[PDB]
Ligand binder design. Sequence first.
Ligand SMILES: [Mg+2]
Ligand SMILES: [Mg+2]
Ligand SMILES: [Mg+2]
Ligand SMILES: [Mg+2]
Ligand SMILES: [Mg+2]
Ligand SMILES: [Mg+2]
Ligand SMILES: [Mg+2]
Ligand SMILES: [Mg+2]
Ligand SMILES: [Mg+2]
Ligand SMILES: [Mg+2]
Ligand SMILES: [Mg+2]
Ligand SMILES: [Mg+2]
Ligand SMILES: [Mg+2]
Ligand SMILES: [Mg+2]
Ligand SMILES: [Mg+2]
Ligand SMILES: [Mg+2]
Ligand SMILES: [Mg+2]
Ligand SMILES: [Mg+2]
Ligand SMILES: [Mg+2]
Ligand SMILES: [Mg+2]
Ligand SMILES: [Mg+2]
Ligand SMILES: [Mg+2]
Ligand SMILES: [Mg+2]
Ligand SMILES: [Mg+2]
Ligand SMILES: [Zn+2]
Ligand SMILES: [Zn+2]
Lengths: 127, 97, 91, 97, 25, 201, 214
Amino acid sequence: SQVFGVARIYASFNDTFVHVTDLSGKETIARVTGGMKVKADRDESSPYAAMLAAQDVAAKCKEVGITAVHVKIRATGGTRTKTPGPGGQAALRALARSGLRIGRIEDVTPVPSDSTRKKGGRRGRRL
Amino acid sequence: PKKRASNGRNKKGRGHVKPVRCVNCSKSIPKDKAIKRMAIRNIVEAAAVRDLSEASVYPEYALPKTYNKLHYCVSCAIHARIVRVRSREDRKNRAPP
Amino acid sequence: AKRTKKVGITGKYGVRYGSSLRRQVKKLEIQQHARYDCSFCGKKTVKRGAAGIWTCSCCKKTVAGGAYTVSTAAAATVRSTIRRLREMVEA
Amino acid sequence: SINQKLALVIKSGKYTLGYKSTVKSLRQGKSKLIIIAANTPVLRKSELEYYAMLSKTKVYYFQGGNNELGTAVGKLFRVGVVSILEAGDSDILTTLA
Amino acid sequence: MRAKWRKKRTRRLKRKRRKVRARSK
Amino acid sequence: GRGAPLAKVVFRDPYKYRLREEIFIANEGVHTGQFIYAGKKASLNVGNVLPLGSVPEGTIVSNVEEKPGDRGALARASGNYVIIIGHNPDENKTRVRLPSGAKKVISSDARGVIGVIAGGGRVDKPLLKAGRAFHKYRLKRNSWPKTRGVAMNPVDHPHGGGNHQHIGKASTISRGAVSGQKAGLIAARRTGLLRGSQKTQ
Amino acid sequence: VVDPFTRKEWFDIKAPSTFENRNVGKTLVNKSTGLKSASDALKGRVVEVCLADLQGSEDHSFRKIKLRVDEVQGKNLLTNFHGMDFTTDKLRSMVRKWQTLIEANVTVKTSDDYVLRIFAIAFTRKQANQVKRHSYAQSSHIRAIRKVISEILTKEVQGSTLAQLTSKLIPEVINKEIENATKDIFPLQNIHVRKVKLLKQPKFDVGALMALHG
RNA sequence: GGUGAAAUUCUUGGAUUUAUUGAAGACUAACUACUGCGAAAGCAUUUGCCAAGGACGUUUUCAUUAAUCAAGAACGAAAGUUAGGGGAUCGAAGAUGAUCAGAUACCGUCGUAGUCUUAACCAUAAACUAUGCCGACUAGGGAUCGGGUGGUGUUUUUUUAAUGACCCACUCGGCACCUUACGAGAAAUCAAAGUCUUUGGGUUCUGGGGGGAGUAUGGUCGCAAGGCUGAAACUUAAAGGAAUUG
Ligand SMILES: [Mg+2]
Ligand SMILES: [Mg+2]
Ligand SMILES: [Mg+2]
Ligand SMILES: [Mg+2]
Ligand SMILES: [Mg+2]
Ligand SMILES: [Mg+2]
Ligand SMILES: [Mg+2]
Ligand SMILES: [Mg+2]
Ligand SMILES: [Mg+2]
Ligand SMILES: [Mg+2]
Ligand SMILES: [Mg+2]
Ligand SMILES: [Mg+2]
Ligand SMILES: [Mg+2]
Ligand SMILES: [Mg+2]
Ligand SMILES: [Mg+2]
Ligand SMILES: [Mg+2]
Ligand SMILES: [Mg+2]
Ligand SMILES: [Mg+2]
Ligand SMILES: [Mg+2]
Ligand SMILES: [Mg+2]
Ligand SMILES: [Mg+2]
Ligand SMILES: [Mg+2]
Ligand SMILES: [Mg+2]
Ligand SMILES: [Mg+2]
Ligand SMILES: [Zn+2]
Ligand SMILES: [Zn+2]
């Protein structure tokens, strides 16, 4: 029905990323992350900032090619915390409530088979 | 004196297991001692469940949630997640709830 | 009886040059003077002269090789890597 | 296995070891089967091979060197070629070989 | 003080008495 | 005076009845009596000599031509070799990593011989006494032994001179320095103890 | 003051033969100019679209597909089969504790010469009457099944290109034949071909590429 | 980017992010469990080969061939050492950004050695069950691993089988857990830590108030760091265990 694209939301901690690209992926459009719409440098990840970024992100998305987008949510991944970031939920909620269509979304965050020993060493990060 | 017949945690007749890393403070810790939790949570939530199937294509879709294992360091499992602390005889109880 | 507790063949150098140099030499001298198994006649008649030259007592076959040993580790791994890559060209 | 086959022939059969003596066998046709060490030289091989087809003797090329074929025949020296004049209790003459 | 650093403390001292002594050989 | 064994390899002259004897450098494992194959269409075997285009990437070759037909240029010393890191059929080049580690691109019709050069590891053996060093250069040239420029008089050297034995000025000397100036570390881009992982990226 | 959108060309992705719909989506490249145009420049990209989007039925909701694009004509660029993936969520729920996981794979060619590697994944299930809470296998079981999976996986490939290979996978002919030889050893469950990757491909062959198009 | 918050830092070099594709070294996620195995250290992707082993089954064979052990020897986590290779990752040292009154640190960045492997050393770990080994006897319970036996037991249909998985009971031998306590302990607790003043099945090692001290000295091993062996003078009335209450 509509015209599809890929949301590909990388939500880490202490920042959150949202940009639509072509369904092939090689061509990208309109990024505007969460650290853009506010500078507190702490608040870079906040859900209220993520919504602010989804506002400028959905704006151009319907201002160029896309009436619809498939999303792929992603965490830090690799040897890091692997769990969802704060501004992940906010971005989807805010790009869905922008009227834009949603379908068939999955979790693409990188999963190792336990290698490349993690940082902070054996005794862990302690304070 | 010995405060646990499990000692730290369950390994018996093995003598070496292999350590995992804390998902929080990244401390090493034997898998037998790991204090593990399954994370079962929807990609969406209580708020966005409606806003999901509303503005979206497909008949209500699927809603394919996300699952991963968590490992904690004690000191970091004590700091937050299932620990509390328990009485002399409350300790022994292995009941999950 | 046993002659030397360590120095072995390196005993000729007497007290000189310092231990670590004698020990380092003793490895490779021992390595170069020894007789090796011939890849042809099967008897270990292969000895050395000069450097990279390894010849066989009978059979008169002479095979180029490492300086103080016959097969060098390097070539050893080159043997296999060609044994690999050559087979890409048939099957 | 193929060496197990030879350990039978050696104790239960009749044979000759070496080059010249199997050439004697090949010319008198006394050889049913000969066996060749993988490290034995090629010229000799093709000669052995020629005499063989003139004796209509079947030829199995043993994979291994003379050192091992010597260990194969239960002898402390080495052997480049074996000849079987009489197969004993062993089945080597009619088999995969 | 911690046994392990007290083990270090005596390990060092054994090493320095070693020096000082060998000077006398 | 060469640290590597050579190999005399005899062919037939295609244009005249005669035997023509070349001189190769012996790649480890080659031997008296072995058959050596030479050409674009040739097998991949230690000692045969092929154009670099005609061997797959990963190939380990010696004595390779810089220009195609200079009868060999790169990696002639004992133990040295070059590895093809792959080709560009269009304008038919081939990229390689020389013993220095440097990466050069040459013609695919540049010829090389499979394997590594023999006499490997000659350098791992301590030269021990002076004489061994001596006789080493006896067959090379008169380079040995070396007098420190700091040991001579000012006439004899830039480093020469002083009531104490010393260099007196930086021992790094520019590229544009002039004959009789350059003695030292010449055009050095850094100096001091090499700390940490070396090689390349 | 540029706005490349006033520059960028547009394009539409056409799907291959054995599927439901050939119509896929849109894309952005650039205008086709002399000296680095829009044609030979890219076009070789891939698209990940769940085949439940491609087939339209929801029984196929998992099982993603990568489509490499070969040629282009008249604002219409086809695509071919670059591989198949499993959805991350399905696998993650597919993996449950209290049981045995089994995986095997093999590298195999086809008649139209293509090299790939197909995987498999299976799980051990209890039985209708089964009292014990886990149901593991005997590890001789585990070795045997892989040999059987390998026995069966190789036969299906060299299956006349990827064409007949693609039409084999969609119905899960494979899955069932696995279950067949399997039951004589252990009951199991699930048993999907999971992922298959393409590490090598033949020359272009403009003629045979058009076999799936029309 | 990173954090409690910041900074050091990276960004006309399109940084972070996207895509295809490639290389290098390491690791074996999820499955992984009061689950398996090995003398311990230790051991988790596939396949092939090389040899090894327990438990079981046994109306097989030998026939006291055994039990435990100074001397002596095989192995031996990590770090560490020598000689190559490797050197992604993480990262003692070092240099830094911060925090502090100070902050040689905790947190952030850079990163040498190390981490990986081959050959050769080293021989220590809270190497722990802080609990020697062989034999016997003494008590109840449901789980589980491996082997076996028993069936007009279920499930797989092809035509019933045969198989395979599964269920029930029983029995050897495992890893464990539960409940009791006859009994034991100073107690915490222990199916051994029980069958000890009603004190004896065999056998090896170690300890004899706390410091001094695992120091001094000798001998021996090692390239080193260090390993084994290992005192005394003097000092001191407690040190210490488990539990009770504040
Ligand atoms: Mg804390
Ligand atoms: Mg305590
Ligand atoms: Mg443990
Ligand atoms: Mg241990
Ligand atoms: Mg002196
Ligand atoms: Mg001179
Ligand atoms: Mg000098
Ligand atoms: Mg000099
Ligand atoms: Mg000098
Ligand atoms: Mg002078
Ligand atoms: Mg001067
Ligand atoms: Mg000057
Ligand atoms: Mg001077
Ligand atoms: Mg000086
Ligand atoms: Mg695995
Ligand atoms: Mg490093
Ligand atoms: Mg520092
Ligand atoms: Mg400071
Ligand atoms: Mg000890
Ligand atoms: Mg312990
Ligand atoms: Mg009992
Ligand atoms: Mg039965
Ligand atoms: Mg009592
Ligand atoms: Mg005191
Ligand atoms: Zn932790
Ligand atoms: Zn010979």
